[model samples]
Target: ASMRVVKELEDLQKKPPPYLRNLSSDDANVLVWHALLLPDQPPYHLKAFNLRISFPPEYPFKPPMIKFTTKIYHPNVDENGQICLPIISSENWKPCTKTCQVLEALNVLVNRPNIREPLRMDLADLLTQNPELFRKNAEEFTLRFGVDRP
Candidate 1:
């Protein structure tokens, strides 16, 4: 219900997650939201990213779409900033799922990428099969393309 969405938004605002921020200025339009991702975990502990979340009319019954507006150097996130967030998947979603939970998923993916099912298979290969080079190149890409707290 629309009320549930509004309720969730208020709850999130009241007790916001540590690394996520609701970038929307006014509460007039909460359907399309913007946010920043600042993970405090390794490999990506020093990175920053922009995220977009879209909530449909169905909302809680139907999980929102999560997108990384900023490019990331992880196996789970692809070139276009799309990611495979299992929590929001059709099969995995439940009406009780919260937005904070979804952001937590993003942090885990950034810290420890899902190489087993990667959007960037090459990066996955590097992570799973070539650890030495993976860490160096991944960190380099993070520093080069990713932003930091300013």
Candidate 2:
């Protein structure tokens, strides 16, 4: 079981899905850490999000699991912390994407959340209607994630 799992992880790491071709686990981890630490960065609020990446026993060919360990209110993030990023959904994912690519895609998702394909439609609607509320929620999530401090 362990060997199969490791083999799957290795295979996925070697040839990730297309949209994620540019990503690598090492690079993705670095990017996630940097984002977490750099609030002043372009992808500011995203820094507050905690991410966990896992490669299942059948990775690459299948999808490695990605989850948010942070409290977030987004259309792409469900209550259980599952992310519905297009790359992992019925869209552009391919067997060439790397972890870094996923990170990059996540950054994109943060900047431009797809309301039409929402994970939290209420939050998305509220975000479109009330910027203050959205900001407050983001701040609250940041606090919950313990991202307010260095």
Candidate 3:
């Protein structure tokens, strides 16, 4: 699973999705991977988002769970870190979907949030009412997650 995920990550890094800032490998989970965006890059950049891909022992029988560890201010993401990605949604999630698809879905969510179907109302309102505040929250989250603090 690790090798497969590594190869997938490498392939993704080669021609990354437009919303991705950058993707990096971590020593944390055997299947877990992390990606961040470049500073002042774009509104939908996932640089502040941290993805965790959990593959159960059942393997392909079940789909990997993707979530953000950073303080993301989005409608599709819950305060508990669960994501509302269409692929991850019980109604839409399918084992046939590749990990790359999940990553791309998340990347799209970073900028093109689904406020109507959001998991967080405050975040949705912020995204609608005050774009600057939303950017500030996202930047603060990036600093805390993308950068190492002492």
Per-residue error for 70 in candidate 2, Å, reads 1.9
Pick by lDDT: which candidate is best?
1
Please write out the lDDT profile of model 3 over residues 1-150, one tens digit for every residue. 666666777888898765454576667765666765332334434344555667665545566777666655557777667876777666777767777788766666765778787788888888789979887886666565553321
Winner by lDDT between candidate 2 and candidate 1:
1
Q: TM-score of the candidate numbered 1?
A: 0.85
The lDDT values for all models are 0.78, 0.57, 0.65
Query: Which of 2 and 3 is ahead in TM-score?
Result: 3
**Which sections of candidate 2 miss by over 4 Å?**
1-47, 90-92, 148-150
Top candidate by TM-score: 1
Instruction: Please identify model 1 stretches exceeding 4 Å from their true place.
Output: 22-28
State the lDDT of candidate 1 residue by residue for 44-96, as single tens digits: 66777788888889988899988888777778887888888999999999988
lDDT of 3: 0.65
RMSD of each: 2.2, 7.1, 4.1
- Model 3's number of clashes is 5
Residue 51 shift from truth in candidate 2, angstroms: 1.3
1-150: candidate 2 lDDT, tens digit per residue? 344444544665586543232223445432122123123322244445556666655545665567765556566778677887767653666757654566667767766778787888887898789868877776666555634433
Regions of model 3 farther than 4 Å from truth: 1-7, 13-15, 18-29, 37-47, 132-150
